[PDB]
Homo-oligomer: A and B are copies of this chain.
Amino acid sequence: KAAESQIRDVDFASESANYSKANILAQSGSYAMAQANSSQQNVLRLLQ
């Protein structure tokens, strides 16, 4: 029963680290997308 646990279950020690890392990366990626969508507003200064 212990040898099976070694294969099947997850260790919350590492799992919470992975989750927090992925969450901060999600925030960063959302900011990057929000900036990428806006990165073209400068063209209007040419046209106006």
Contact = CB atoms under 8 A, between A and B. Distances in A.
Nearest to A11: B43
Interface in A1-48: 12-13, 16, 43, 46-47
Contacts of A43: 12-13
Nearest to A16: B46
Main secondary structure of the interface of A (DSSP, over half): helix
Contacts of A47: 12, 16
A16 B16 CA distance: 53
A20 to B, nearest CB: 10
Contacts of A46: 12-13, 16
7 contacts: A12-B43, A12-B46, A12-B47, A13-B43, A13-B46, A16-B46, A16-B47
